[PDB]
Structure 1
Amino acid sequence: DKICLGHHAVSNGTKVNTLTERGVEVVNATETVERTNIPRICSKGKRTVDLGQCGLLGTITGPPQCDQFLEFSADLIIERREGSDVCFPGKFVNEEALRQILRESGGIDKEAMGFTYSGIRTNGATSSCRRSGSSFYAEMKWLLSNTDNAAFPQMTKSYKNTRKNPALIVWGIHHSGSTAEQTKLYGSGNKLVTVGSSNYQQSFVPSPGARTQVNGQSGRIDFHWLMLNPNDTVTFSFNGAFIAPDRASFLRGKSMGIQSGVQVDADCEGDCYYSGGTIISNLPFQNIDSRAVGKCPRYVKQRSLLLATGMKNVPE
């Protein structure tokens, strides 16, 4: 008698958008924008460093917060909000670029340079590090001359960078808290530091600080960043205040390290990280955070975009 062709329906479906109208009801649709995050870092199968009170930029310099993490290899490097890059107060002159390469550096390897002269006192008494007593960073010397009324000798120390890898050279300049400190801690007179290379050619001069008492001590450290190409030579020609590195830093490889505020979960794996957690979904878009690292869904502003998987729902 009668036959009929028709299609399935549901009593109540979901609503998707189309090119000509909004709120089109379909039987089934899925989400294309991820909204659910994992509160913890999914680092399973990858080597990680969970760096706490120490910041990432300090892995070269060696603040007491991460003395044990001076030399390591890693696949994922994690910096924390509480992390600090100083013992004695200071800042890097090109802080963001150096951090950017460290997050891409894969870790750190080191090779000693030297500064094997006399008249110099390695410890450099600072009261902001209490691992055993007054000291400066594990990897740097304060060339303070022969205590009081001691002129600083002229030094011309170079490093040849004999390995095939480019060398990361980090050194610094000490801005004392006052003119009296320049006079008695590094001796009287003017202070000049000249740093040469095939491509650097830059001089620095310290000045009396008279700055606020950040972490008790006034003054600042300028951490200066230099890159060497294979077989190049870095030259440190100076007679002024100088923070002498003991070891040059070299890269390891890939990292894509992520700054994060949450605990590390070693039992889950994924590649998208953000400061508030991770994304382990395979949806094309997210509205969780735009500041994603790795093979991550693309950031959009819409809270949710539903992609239809069924056909138009016309209920009976």
Structure 2
Amino acid sequence: TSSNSPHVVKTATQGEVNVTGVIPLTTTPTKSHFANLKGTETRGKLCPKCLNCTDLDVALGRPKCTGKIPSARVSILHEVRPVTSGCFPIMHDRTKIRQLPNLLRGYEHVRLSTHNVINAEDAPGGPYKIGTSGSCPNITNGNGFFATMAWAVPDNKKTATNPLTIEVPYVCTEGEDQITVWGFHSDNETQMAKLYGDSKPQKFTSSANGVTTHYVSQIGGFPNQTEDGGLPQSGRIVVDYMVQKSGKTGTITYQRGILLPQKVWCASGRSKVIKGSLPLIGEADCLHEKYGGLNKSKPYYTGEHAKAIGNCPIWVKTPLKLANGTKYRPPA
């Protein structure tokens, strides 16, 4: 049997040949919405039930953004450059803190610890009272602060000090990484003198797993407030994080204005992470970075290559076709 047979398939050695029928093996996906991956739990926001909170407010323990983070095996990197929506003004671009939520989403299991890692009141530098702010209202609308940090303000003896050292213990269970959030406060000359007793720039360091840093505070002259509670403040904070690989302790060096670690993040396992955009609508068999959810109608696809999670078509360079029929046999 023969029919009008202009279909063209390629062979490894004969170049192109004409056949009586083909089976397309490839398709071209159309960009759509991200969706939950079918079957496997997919993480969007870190805390889907923490309303009027974003991933960086959850990561920092903002009052009223605390809660459980569901475990997930698949995560979508919604915000490339995470932002805050409340509490104390943070000079975010001075450190690497904006990426904290993008680190937490990379773990399968993420939980905030149950006990303070450091007794903040009794610590080097003398007895401290723990500071609060009107910008960080708690569940009874009183003045709170981030759950992960204690704003340690000297109770008395408001004098300048020498760098002090705290070894931050490992409190997570074996196999969990411990992510410690710490930082410092700074204010203008008048308030530093009234609040800490030392108006000159303060110095801070940290170390974990061989990785070290150093900060010097800024006194006065602060940048305009963004991404915060909306109340004016004369001061600002700098927030950073330290990652302690399982079994190791870390070290923090500080002078005045230290925000000491309190609750810490414990995390383990690995999520599969791709870039994407929320909301997740419906379900899909494959989540692709450029095309959103796909349902693998054909085993291969052409189009733009990108990362993907799930029962995905395999990207190929060209359209592919199998011959179904014989070579073209003109009606002669």
Question: In the alignment, is the contact (CA less than 8 A) between 1:260 and 1:276 conserved in 2?
Answer: no
Q: 159, 166, 173: which one pairs with 2:168?
A: 159
Per the TM alignment, residue 298 of structure 1 is displaced from its structure 2 partner at its CA by: 5.2
Q: How does 1:146-295 map to 2 (within 5 A)?
A: 146=155, 150-151=158-159, 156-161=165-170, 163-174=173-184, 176=186, 178-190=188-200, 191-197=202-208, 199-208=210-219, 209-215=221-227, 216=230, 221-265=237-281, 268=283, 270-274=285-289, 277-281=292-296, 283-287=299-303, 290-293=306-309
Percent identity over the alignment is 18
Change (3 A) 1:289 1:56: farther
Asked if structure 2 preserves the Cα contact closer than 8 Å seen for 1:159 and 1:233, the reply is yes
In structure 2, give the amino acid aligned to 1:173: G
C-alpha change, 1:177 and 1:298, in structure 2 (3 Å) is farther
Describe the SS at the equivalent of 2:205: strand
Q: In 2, are the aligned partners of 1:14 and 1:29 still within 8 Å (CA)?
A: no
Give 1:109's aligned residue: 111
8 A Cα contact 1:164 1:230, kept in partner: yes
Are 2:149 and 2:262, in contact at CA under 8 Å, matched by a contact in 1?
yes
Q: Which moved more, 1:291-300 or 1:210-219?
A: 291-300
**Superposition RMSD on alpha carbons, in Å?**
4.1
Cα pair 2:185 2:259 within 8 Å, conserved: no
2:150 matched residue in structure 1: 141
**Alpha-carbon distance in structure 1 between the residues aligned to 2:64 and 2:192:** 28
Q: Distance in 2 between matches of 1:96 and 1:313?
A: 62
Q: 1:296 to 1:66 in 2, by over 3 A?
A: farther
Q: CA deviation at 1:66?
A: 3.8
Q: Could you tell me how far apart the structure 2 residues matched to 1:134 and 1:96 are? A: 24
2:321 corresponds in structure 1 to 307
Cα distance change, pair 61–295 in 1 and its aligned pair in 2 (3 A)? farther
Deviations 1:180-234 (A, max 9, x none): 4444444324422233456244432211342123245576543323232443222
Shift in Å at residue 125 of structure 1? Answer: 0.4
Structure 1: unaligned runs, 5 residues or longer: 1-6
1:30 to 14, 19, 24: 24
Distance 1:258 1:66 in 2: 24
SS at match of 1:115: coil
Contact 2:184 2:238 (8 Å CA) reproduced: yes
Deviations 1:79-128 (A, max 9, x none): 53596346333437345875564343113134331224254344530526
More deviation, 207-216/25-34: 25-34
Check conservation: 1:26, 1:308, Cα contact below 8 A: no
Distance 1:189 1:99 in 2: 33
Cα distance between partner residues in 1 of 2:236 and 2:40: 37
| Aligned counterpart, 2:59 | 60
Q: Out of 229-238 and 174-183, give the one that drifted further.
A: 174-183
The 2-side partners of 1:66 and 1:195 are apart by 26
The 3 A distance-change label for structure 1 pair 96 and 238 is: closer
Deviates more, 1:242-251 or 1:125-134: 125-134
Alpha-carbon distance between aligned partners in 2 of 1:286 and 1:200, rounded to the nearest angstrom = 43
8 Å CA contact retained: 1:261, 1:276: no
What's the offset of the Cα at 1:265? 4.7
**TM superposition score normalised by structure 1:** 0.72
Specify the code of the residue in structure 2 equivalent to 1:214.
T
Q: Deviations over 1:125-160 (max 9, x none)?
A: 05266752543323222223349x944777543333
- Say if 1:297 and 1:276 are closer, same or farther in 2 by CA, change over 3 A: closer
Compute the displacement of 1:264 (Å). 2.9
Query: Normalising by the residue count of structure 2, what TM-score does the alignment of the two structures yield?
Result: 0.70
Whether the 8 Å contact between 2:83 and 2:98 is mirrored in structure 1 is no
- Is the partner of 2:92 in helix, strand or coil? strand
Partners of 2:319 and 2:63 in 1: how far apart? 48
CA 1:56–1:203 in structure 2 vs 1: closer, same or farther (change >3 Å)? same
Q: CA deviation at 1:305?
A: 1.7
Partner of residue 3, structure 1: none
Shift in Å, 1:269: 5.1
Moved more, 180-189 or 227-236: 180-189
